[PDB]
Design an enzyme around this catalytic site. Structure first.
Site, PDB file in Angstrom:
ATOM      1  N   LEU A 198      25.915   3.460  15.378  1.00 54.52           N
ATOM      2  CA  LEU A 198      24.823   2.930  16.185  1.00 54.52           C
ATOM      3  C   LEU A 198      25.271   1.828  17.130  1.00 54.52           C
ATOM      4  O   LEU A 198      24.722   1.711  18.230  1.00 54.52           O
ATOM      5  CB  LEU A 198      23.704   2.397  15.284  1.00 54.52           C
ATOM      6  CG  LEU A 198      22.945   3.446  14.467  1.00 54.52           C
ATOM      7  CD1 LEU A 198      21.947   2.771  13.540  1.00 54.52           C
ATOM      8  CD2 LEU A 198      22.238   4.449  15.370  1.00 54.52           C
ATOM      9  N   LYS A 234      24.994  -2.023   8.186  1.00 50.97           N
ATOM     10  CA  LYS A 234      25.977  -2.874   8.837  1.00 50.97           C
ATOM     11  C   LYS A 234      27.090  -3.223   7.861  1.00 50.97           C
ATOM     12  O   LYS A 234      26.839  -3.475   6.677  1.00 50.97           O
ATOM     13  CB  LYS A 234      25.329  -4.153   9.369  1.00 50.97           C
ATOM     14  CG  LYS A 234      26.283  -5.031  10.164  1.00 50.97           C
ATOM     15  CD  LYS A 234      25.549  -6.130  10.915  1.00 50.97           C
ATOM     16  CE  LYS A 234      26.490  -6.883  11.842  1.00 50.97           C
ATOM     17  NZ  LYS A 234      25.780  -7.909  12.656  1.00 50.97           N
ATOM     18  N   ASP A 282      23.448 -15.376  19.871  1.00 51.07           N
ATOM     19  CA  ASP A 282      23.873 -14.136  20.512  1.00 51.07           C
ATOM     20  C   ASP A 282      22.669 -13.419  21.108  1.00 51.07           C
ATOM     21  O   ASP A 282      22.598 -12.186  21.106  1.00 51.07           O
ATOM     22  CB  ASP A 282      24.603 -13.219  19.528  1.00 51.07           C
ATOM     23  CG  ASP A 282      25.467 -12.183  20.224  1.00 51.07           C
ATOM     24  OD1 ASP A 282      25.743 -12.346  21.431  1.00 51.07           O
ATOM     25  OD2 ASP A 282      25.867 -11.201  19.564  1.00 51.07           O
TER      26      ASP A 282
HETATM   27  C1  LIG Z   1      20.650  -4.150  17.759  1.00 54.59           C
HETATM   28  C2  LIG Z   1      21.984  -3.589  18.216  1.00 54.59           C
HETATM   29  C3  LIG Z   1      23.186  -4.534  18.058  1.00 54.59           C
HETATM   30  N1  LIG Z   1      23.851  -3.487  17.304  1.00 54.59           N
HETATM   31  C4  LIG Z   1      25.073  -3.408  16.694  1.00 54.59           C
HETATM   32  O1  LIG Z   1      25.440  -2.390  16.112  1.00 54.59           O
HETATM   33  C5  LIG Z   1      25.926  -4.656  16.800  1.00 54.59           C
HETATM   34  C6  LIG Z   1      26.913  -4.718  15.720  1.00 54.59           C
HETATM   35  N2  LIG Z   1      27.694  -4.766  14.864  1.00 54.59           N
HETATM   36  C7  LIG Z   1      22.748  -2.539  17.343  1.00 54.59           C
HETATM   37  C8  LIG Z   1      23.029  -1.222  18.050  1.00 54.59           C
HETATM   38  C9  LIG Z   1      21.836  -0.374  17.591  1.00 54.59           C
HETATM   39  N3  LIG Z   1      21.542  -0.868  16.247  1.00 54.59           N
HETATM   40  C10 LIG Z   1      20.459  -0.382  15.568  1.00 54.59           C
HETATM   41  N4  LIG Z   1      19.849   0.731  16.063  1.00 54.59           N
HETATM   42  C11 LIG Z   1      18.776   1.240  15.429  1.00 54.59           C
HETATM   43  N5  LIG Z   1      18.182   0.786  14.318  1.00 54.59           N
HETATM   44  C12 LIG Z   1      18.798  -0.309  13.856  1.00 54.59           C
HETATM   45  N6  LIG Z   1      18.405  -0.985  12.734  1.00 54.59           N
HETATM   46  C13 LIG Z   1      19.231  -2.055  12.523  1.00 54.59           C
HETATM   47  C14 LIG Z   1      20.170  -2.057  13.533  1.00 54.59           C
HETATM   48  C15 LIG Z   1      19.907  -0.946  14.394  1.00 54.59           C
HETATM   49  C16 LIG Z   1      22.223  -2.122  15.969  1.00 54.59           C
END
Ligand SMILES: C[C@H]1CN(C(=O)CC#N)[C@]12CCN(c1ncnc3[nH]ccc13)C2
EC number: 2.7.10.2
Length: 289
Positions: free
Chosen positions: A15, A42, A136
């Site tokens: 992601l 994460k 950030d």
């Molecule tokens: C918010 C941005 C920053 N990032 C990173 O990956 C940075 C790092 N390491 C994302 C990309 C998309 N992301 C998600 N997308 C969909 N649902 C989600 N739930 C929790 C997170 C998440 C996380």
């Protein structure tokens, strides 16, 4: 569940990545019949003990936050031997706001952007009430829950203020997002709720440029900075900010919004508006569109 079994987290795709972390899309499938729910997970990559201890604090921060404008903590997953800690969060399929703006500029107007700005602002007001500095704040760290709902959704750099001070000095490995950082963060490595306000001004710029890469904060500042021998990039950036140079008013950006940006970019942190004061003004503007 609040503890997710690592063997039941089925990897689907990446992601995102940022700082020293990476977030992956997983289906938590205890039954193995592929019926489980999607979750965002994460984890650290190329990280030592210092980053591991930081990641544990990140988890405890997000676990303690409860806001409609902050991504929901779901739990943790301990890898084999309790050696690779993982943070499990709700999955918002619409993705991050940066990508969303770059895809849907045509069908988004100023009122919708002001709505997002208002929700980000309320999320940041809540963070401030928890004495948490985000460090950030950028469109890439905002998630779209729906067409009319965004959430602050990454806390890899977030810190809790000490009880005796409203600021915090942070010097850590990694590349800083210098083009979102207030002068005191760039020079003195000081971070506060009012340095977040500076970054929020940059977020306002991002939203009303639809995160266009050709006029992103880095592209804009790099043009202003130029390139001089024996003048590092950080120094030239500090110099142009001290001179009063700022990101330009995005085309079609409402004048009132540009004014708010400039107020968020006051040289000294104490001269910037609080999130509590920005909120009502953003709500008023969103009500006027
Ligand atoms: C918010 C941005 C920053 N990032 C990173 O990956 C940075 C790092 N390491 C994302 C990309 C998309 N992301 C998600 N997308 C969909 N649902 C989600 N739930 C929790 C997170 C998440 C996380």
């Amino acid at each position: 569940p609040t503890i997710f079994e690592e063997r039941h987290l089925k990897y689907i795709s990446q992601l995102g990545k940022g700082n020293f972390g990476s977030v992956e899309l997983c289906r938590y499938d205890p039954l193995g019949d592929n019926t489980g729910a999607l979750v965002a997970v994460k984890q650290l990559q190329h990280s030592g003990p210092d980053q591991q201890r930081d990641f544990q604090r990140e988890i405890q921060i997000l676990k303690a936050l409860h806001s409609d404008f902050i991504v929901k903590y779901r739990g943790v997953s301990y890898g084999p031997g309790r050696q690779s800690l993982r943070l499990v969060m709700e999955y918002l399929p619409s993705g991050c706001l940066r990508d969303f703006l770059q895809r849907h500029r045509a069908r988004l107007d100023a009122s919708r952007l002001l709505l997002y700005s208002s929700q980000i602002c309320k999320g940041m007001e809540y963070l401030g009430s928890r004495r948490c500095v985000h460090r950030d704040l950028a469109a890439r760290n905002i998630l779209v829950e729906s067409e009319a709902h965004v959430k602050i959704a990454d806390f890899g750099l977030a810190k809790l203020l000490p009880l005796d001070k409203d600021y915090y000095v942070v010097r850590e490995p990694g590349q800083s997002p210098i083009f979102w950082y207030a002068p005191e963060s760039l020079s003195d490595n000081i971070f506060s709720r009012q340095s977040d306000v500076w970054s929020f001004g940059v977020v306002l710029y991002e939203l009303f440029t639809y995160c266009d890469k050709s006029c992103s904060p880095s592209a804009e500042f790099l043009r202003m900075m130029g390139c001089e021998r024996d003048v590092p990039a950080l120094c030239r950036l500090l110099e142009l900010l001290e001179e009063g140079q700022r990101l330009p008013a995005p085309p079609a950006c409402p004048a009132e919004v540009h004014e708010l940006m400039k107020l968020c970019w006051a040289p000294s942190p104490q001269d910037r508006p609080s999130f509590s004061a920005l909120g009502p003004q953003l709500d008023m503007l969103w009500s006027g569109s």
